[PDB]
């Protein structure tokens, strides 16, 4: 017996709970109130040597006094007192001690020590510690709510359901709770002194009561276990949604490569976690919207949406937003628009979103049923939606007509596999009478165009991830140095790496003295290129003489570069013309190698346009990377009467950068080709730069 | 007392309303309920030849039998019969006939005839027509609701306030009515057969019961009149907020110059409308949020925001969002930091947003009061916000807690001039107990961070419009050529403009035969040219040579250009290096000249980076335009060792383009320089394009 068995109770039905420090203050009162109103069937014990009884319930003098097996202890005494609570809870083999209060490892040195002593006393029996400094947790299916916050809400009650949430915030849970989400479990993680996000996530992965997971992430502590927890989730086919706080936080660290400034730590992490299936959103509203749509067991087979409205204006605005969010509302198929213009010749030209109100003499009922019957079967439409404002408090007349397409959606639900969604353009709360109808038929309901669009976008991304089947590999970071400094590699070594990886370098050689430079240059032709050496950025200090015709200009350009006390110089051909890109990889401290590719050259950081990819990179993927940058791609096709460049050579070079990255990331943490010149034939590595540490 | 005086009743108290075609159906019933429930104090008359009474209220057989002065008629009978109603209503000098039924000017040509027949019979007495084909209108301050739609909402009434709305979309009004806006008047424009948007807007401009205006725009019809109404609103210091549909719609109209593609009609219109004070937003939620904040009589003096929260995670998400929306949250002043350090040193270093929860042993009530009292007086902070989720149904303890900063805001409201706002991070419904505290104190309340940020940004924009007090002139499009076919100007006339406008081309001369060219070329020296004339877009068809180093290479090039049968050939000196910009103007069929400026060259449309300005352009305006394009601006300063370019000449160029546009817009509808080369000294137009007719 040990910590592993005890962990399991967090996702299960507890038979008994003891509340230590039970008194007349909010934590106790709300604990008892929650267990009452949420219909806990187990036994509650109160422990406090200061009181005879509370609410008529006996207050025990000690956990040791209780004649029963205790599953879960919630400790409410002060931090100093809590050490002995842990010790007594351990003595009786409590499976879990929940410590909602703060003033621990997250409050300073003294409190870190208290926290350590607690862990040490729990280690004895393997009792788990939840928190400290958190709201606790709740389990709607077990009716067990060791949770410090008011759960009972006559007005807007919590609804039980398939969505579970792990949150590193002790302040956003009521926000999730106040949403329309059907909740199963919510874990507030706190200091994660013992039970961490990956632990809760492992539980959720295999919890039959959860089909959808939401994470609210402030900071991942144990990257490897987290990644493995994510993998357990996809293994179990449970979508995982995340909000990650600190998205725009600089990260001030090292970097010799332009790649450093072009790929933020955040975007690197995002790319890796998406590789493992994470569906990122930006805020709670969006998390909710995505989860509400994913809570229905329907997925799209094609990345397109139909919207049926009763407003021209709103249809117009939705269409504009669809472009902003990159959601495809395509024309209806030729069968569909014939099927409709055949029974409703009075609608005319069909747009998507499609306004179907006041366009016919027929009952709106009939117009609606016709359109949705056809649109539902349309092979070019992945998701079927109705976009209609049906605000709370609307009149009966307004209900009669807004409920009509809901009823239709409900009537077609049993005979389609397509995701259905009724959403309102506006954010305001839905009329419950319309929601009742879609809730009864298992149709998703979302408030707000932007959220519905994010939701749809997220469905698609989820579908793609299921299709990949071959997800992102976990890279070991064990060999990686912990030093926080960077050492620039000698240009020689740089060149050696280009070679060994098959990258083509311009004909070049390193000269020691001026005559040698003239002698070498006069043995290759002009123009050549003269570059100072030992620098990360040569151009800035005038260490790059280009287009130097004749040995006359050569000796002069060398004359102007003497102040840069340059050890050896390098001369190369003047690689004529070719589109400038940047191709590199960096070593992420937690995740491993990542490849960076995009608009390159001296102005690379000003273009600020790249794409990332975790190796290995498939040939298909490299091609998609190229085509995903307009100015890059349109240039390869040959822009405005210009020769088409060597796509296939560029593609291969990207793949190759991927394999080198996999090979050398633990030792070389920066490897960059700026610019990698793309030409009619071949691609040329004009420059190279590598860093270590 | 024709048209003019009758129109004013739309904004005032009506004593009598006659409903023609009254029956037991929804339109009559909802009208009567609306007037009952909004407390209409005037007299209602029912008119219908079929009924002797309706629910025992006398039903007159004819308008003509009512022995009272009738102010407003609502016609509910079918279009055909409506002509007879119009004749009757005009005969008794009714001020307004409201037609919300459909089947008129928008239905068919038949409907069109009925409509003009109705206008015909109204002109007899100057009777105004609302609609047809709309829901009517509502004026909360006169308790008058000739409105076809349920306004009665016993549990969440429409609240009377200072915001008024003109919408070209019926189906949208109830979206607004369901919002938290304090409403004055709402006008639904319908077919705008007689009374149009600008008409409603003029009423609102001088309506003392309106202090904030929202427009939901589908298509401006009378541009001059619209602009003038805008200017009346401006004169009366009433902010105008607008949603304008069609933001993403194509318009491949006009256009020989790249400007056509860089500055689409929608962006052009937007710039002009903003010049007249319009505050654009993207959707209904945003319009609501902006109007809520403007409904309080406080404007900021510096363009910054402070936010106080009880969540570190939501603080963090708010910060991230503030970056996306471009809203400044600066550190607090030295005075604020010092002061709070002196009182709550345990808080440590203050960040903004400031999480004030669980940082102190002090009562939250004391912490909150100290922090807000200090932050309200902080000269570096323009807008004071509390950002706290307080959703409906939250517990008694959660209310007690989330209401604390609301009461503090309420208490400090009296002695600050700064805008105050309490917003939730999430979109969902506020706890009405918290909202009430803010409502009673005249403090803005918004739901959702995005809305909050858009509102703050709009406040800054409005305050800036107020400061310039030197607005966009109205340009006449009177003598503006009314053709639709765009004719390219010959390169001949192009270069003439350059000179007349003071632009300076490269050394250049026109030539006809190769010899004439090889001569001239040798006369000015190489490298040079070569460019075909009378063509596109020459470079697309290989009509531009470049870098021709000898008489040999010239003839080579001149021979490749053979097959494009050019009548003329332009020879110019090869203008060395320097930054490529595009500088132009275009004539907008409705608004007049606009200047386009940005990243130029062959890749101009791919860059898609320009800024627009309506002339006259001040020298300082031109500066901003330049510094607003990072790539351009950084190079002007001198990027990475490269020398600084001539800002003054660039700046002066843009001023000049604005002047040329003012002079020549009614004849030359496109004048474009691509590229305008920015050099170390001076600027040089390498190319020219123009169009007329
Ligand atoms: N062999 C070459 N042929 C033609 N052009 C070259 C050649 N080498 C360098 N250049 C040009 O000089 C520019 C800068 O060269 P290089 O990258 O070596 O210097 P740098 O200061 O180290 O640049 P960075 O650090 O921005 O990558 C290149 O972007 C390219 O335009
Ligand atoms: N006199 C010159 N000196 C140096 N470069 C030049 C000169 N004239 C043109 N160019 C180069 O050739 C490019 C195209 O020339 P130009 O604008 O005259 O033809 P174009 O096809 O009409 O271009 P566009 O349609 O984009 O305006 C310019 O953007 C510039 O880079």
Residue numbers in the entry:
A (entry chain B), B (entry chain A): 35 to 727
Quote the study on this structure.
To elucidate the structural basis of DddX catalysis, we solved the crystal structure of DddX in complex with ATP by the single-wavelength anomalous dispersion method using a selenomethionine derivative (Se-derivative). Although there are four DddX monomers arranged as a tetramer in an asymmetric unit, gel filtration analysis indicated that DddX maintains a dimer in solution. Each DddX monomer contains a CoA-binding domain and an ATP-grasp domain, with one loop (Gly280-Tyr300) of the CoA-binding domain inserting into the ATP-grasp domain. ATP is bound in DddX mainly via hydrophilic interactions, including hydrogen bonds and salt bridges. The overall structure of DddX is similar to that of NDP-forming acetyl-CoA synthetase ACD1, with a root mean square deviation (RMSD) between these two structures of 4.6 Å over 581 Cα atoms. ACD1 consists of separate α- and β-subunits, which corresponds to the CoA-binding domain and the ATP-grasp domain of DddX, respectively. Sequence alignment indicated that His292 of DddX is likely the conserved histidine residue to be phosphorylated, and Gly280-Tyr300 is likely the ‘swinging loop’. In the crystal structure of DddX, His292 from loop Gly280-Tyr300 directly forms a hydrogen bond with the γ-phosphate of ATP, suggesting a potential for phosphorylation, which is further supported by mutational analysis. Mutation of His292 to alanine abolished the activity of DddX, indicating the key role of His292 during catalysis. Firstly, His292 is phosphorylated by ATP, forming phosphohistidine, which will be brought to the CoA-binding domain through the conformational change of the swinging loop Gly280-Tyr300.
Genetic and biochemical work showed that Psychrobacter sp. D2 possesses a novel DMSP lyase termed DddX for DMSP catabolism. DddX is an ATP-dependent DMSP lyase which catalyzes a two-step reaction: the ligation of DMSP and CoA, and the cleavage of DMSP-CoA to produce DMS and acryloyl-CoA. Sequence analysis suggests that DddX is an acetate-CoA ligase, which belongs to the acyl-CoA synthetase (ACD) superfamily and requires CoA and ATP as co-substrates for catalysis. Diverse DMSP lyases in some algae, bacteria, and fungi cleave DMSP to yield gaseous dimethyl sulfide (DMS), an infochemical with important roles in atmospheric chemistry.
